[PDB]
Design a protein around this ligand. Structure first.
Ligand SMILES: N[C@@H](CSCCS(N)(=O)=O)C(=O)O
Ligand SMILES: N[C@@H](CSCCS(N)(=O)=O)C(=O)O
Ligand SMILES: N[C@@H](CSCCS(N)(=O)=O)C(=O)O
Ligand SMILES: [Mn+2]
Ligand SMILES: [Mn+2]
Ligand SMILES: [Mn+2]
Ligand SMILES: [Mn+2]
Ligand SMILES: [Mn+2]
Ligand SMILES: [Mn+2]
Lengths: 314, 314, 314
């Protein structure tokens, strides 16, 4: 099966600059090279080039709506394309607002996909409930069907179509949820596992329930939108919104290990890696590497080790 | 339901100065303000003022017995009072020796309460088994019934009455127990979960067994005496007795989260926070904040998030 | 029951110098003294003195084969001796290649022993599958029966006899396995718990299955070969091969605590501690201490605490 790396050097989803340098560091850490060494065909599509919408006025509170709507429009197109040709799309990137485009382009080719969202935040704020207007905290809002027409239309997102419902998404890692965001997820009966659940249940049982809940009836494609801040700040210190008491490095690998085993991985999001937010070179390296490592886990790399088929090492 | 903050800036329970500055930093970190934002009525009773017993000679090994006996006498009175009026008493404080007074005053108004003691130490040394004489490591000894008249009477604790028995107390976090202390807890068949049990069982199952063991028959009030050193030194570095390999920040929040859900929280002890023991400002801040956070957990604040009832955020 | 400390300051098992300074630091940290304080008879046999084989040419890729074969030959003899007299042998040491000698000498006196191997690596590379030739990564290869005559004879290991089979060994901590190594352990149906299993199952259940799998039928002696790098780099930072996402300080104590309770501990290996690889004095101290602590756990020291029998502390 083929794999395609898509860089999405974008950062207008949030105020802190640096995330556009994300895909660049992930590659610099040998994400491709390493990937090639697995049982998958790798092809680097390069980093999409975004054209900055001049005079992008803030739609009420929502900031840079047109720049983000155009950036995501462009990507969704590219993702749909590689999905079309039967390959797995892997989106390295800047902020998490690019998930709007990634999950959209994916949904087109596979309208029956479900989403496993590993993040410390829900990112389900509507243009009406954000307190910052930063779009990187509203992706789920544009993609959900139930949240359709529950908020005014935004400059540039016209092209979007609420493709997935609240019964096809699952959260794992939540620990910092806004009042409104909590309202929406309790209102729409969305399935999730907050750090407290992860604590009570254990990561093993979490993944167990997440699959039987999303693949119970029909076995559909899986889109893994992984927000690097879903691990405790200790492991992935270089991000915009660190939040203590989160997933651990082991837990994050186990979650990507189990998803691999389901053989249903169709799309991936290695979002929020910001090479400029590390208090020391170490931290940034720590962060870029676990991101890399998490990605390789999604595509084979097992901790127990791996060996090439049909080869007798003795 | 009402809540009442009672500062007890005392520190003669142990040699290291600084803990009396405890309640002051907890408030400085917005403990009240934040508390108010929950579904509870908050009322700051202020910091009790302790009068130093002059010429307080050491009763054999036990040090500052009269100062501690008088400090705890004063508090017990105050705690009983707010307990009397039907409010939850929250004791911020200096050393853990003030637990003698807190649990006493509480016991009066509710003689059927049980105690969940999150600490790395047992603090069940009798004036006869301490090796330091520091009283902050003997609280349980004065409160237990079975340990009645098993040690000589001390200058100033006359007013105390062994109110609870060893079948109403539960330990969670133990990892540094003296020879004698271990003897006593094995002798009196006291229930506890040492870091090893927490390791074997998982925090989820720990809490499960702790409740069915203390609320199995009758559902009684719960007194949570939380010694901040019960978390690993990494999370709460500013204390008198750091001990590695302890509870983690997540575990600590889960323990306070579950206790909240039992709806039986009557008294709380946020003991041992020492603003002057942090190797760097960071450490102190780290410590004061998790202490704060643990307290808010006890009264509502959930990681999955919260929203105000009867309010339609859409 | 008696205990005997045997230093094996050897380091030709791997390229990085420093490990021969291992036993010296472990003792410098009071390993003996502390040990004495337990219910065991302690006797320091001192550090074996190894004679360097001059002109030790590399057998193909395998390096320093004669120096290592002679070093291990010497030790096996000493270990068999103290095992003979009915005492427990504790081998402090340099690299893990010395396990060949330790487990051999042990097997002689107790041919029915099983091995619990706490390590991040399998160390089951045959002189034919190593990529470095470093012997500290091939111990199991020489000791296994099934791997008999599957590789050419090496200069100096003639004296060895594949004494244990793949159904008497168990791995716990694996997270960095070579392709070949993985092949061998899957081929020989060897039992193990990789960090992923530890994650899914929990350490408690791990130990549970490890015992019922090795002591299910017959209750035999246990040889614990503990590779200090089996803990995450955070706790034992001073080693040759750090690997992230490994066992935690608590987990490591639990594993040694449970093995103690089985009352079957016959031999111990406190391998790989390298006092010269610590980025700061702290790290080395951190490392030497947990090593020490893990050892004391094997012989009694419980976290819940200990008290001397027949002594009424009241
Ligand atoms: N509540 C915050 C959410 S911050 C979004 C964090 S993320 N996961 O990087 O998208 C907001 O007001 O935007
Ligand atoms: N074993 C020690 C116990 S130190 C008490 C620690 S605490 N939890 O802060 O009260 C003593 O001799 O007092
Ligand atoms: N695959 C490595 C294994 S490194 C052995 C690590 S240890 N546990 O210290 O023996 C090799 O090529 O020797
Ligand atoms: Mn996000
Ligand atoms: Mn996030
Ligand atoms: Mn205490
Ligand atoms: Mn304590
Ligand atoms: Mn090893
Ligand atoms: Mn190793």
């Amino acid at each position: 099966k083929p794999i395609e790396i898509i860089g999405a050097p974008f950062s207008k989803g949030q105020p802190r600059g640096g995330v556009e340098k994300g895909p660049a560091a992930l590659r610099k850490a040998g994400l491709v090279e390493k990937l090639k060494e697995t049982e998958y065909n790798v092809r680097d599509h390069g980093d999409l080039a975004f054209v900055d919408v001049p005079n992008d006025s803030p739609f009420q509170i929502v900031k840079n709506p047109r720049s983000v709507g155009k950036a995501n429009e462009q990507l969704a197109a590219v993702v749909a394309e590689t999905q079309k040709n039967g390959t797995i799309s892997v989106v390295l990137g800047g902020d998490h607002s690019m998930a709007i485009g990634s999950i959209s382009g994916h949904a087109r080719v596979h309208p029956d996909l479900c989403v496993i969202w590993v993040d410390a935040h829900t990112d389900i704020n509507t243009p009406l409930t954000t307190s910052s207007g930063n779009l990187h905290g509203q992706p789920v809002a544009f993609l959900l069907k139930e949240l359709k027409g529950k908020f005014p239309d935004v400059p540039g997102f016209s092209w979007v179509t609420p493709c997935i419902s609240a019964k096809d998404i699952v959260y794992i890692g939540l620990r910092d949820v806004d009042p409104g965001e909590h309202y929406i997820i309790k209102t729409l009966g969305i399935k999730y596992f907050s750090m407290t659940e992860v604590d009570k249940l254990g990561i093993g049982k979490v993944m167990e329930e997440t699959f039987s809940y999303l693949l119970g009836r029909k076995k559909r494609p899986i889109h893994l939108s992984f927000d690097v801040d879903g691990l405790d700040p200790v492991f992935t210190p270089a991000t915009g919104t660190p939040v203590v008491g989160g997933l651990s490095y082991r837990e994050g690998l186990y979650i990507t290990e189990e998803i691999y085993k389901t053989g249903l991985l169709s799309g991936l999001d290695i979002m929020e890696v910001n090479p400029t937010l590390g208090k020391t070179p170490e931290e940034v390296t720590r962060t870029v590497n676990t991101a890399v490592a998490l990605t390789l886990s999604c595509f084979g790399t097992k901790r127990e080790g791996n060996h090439k088929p049909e080869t007798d090492y003795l």
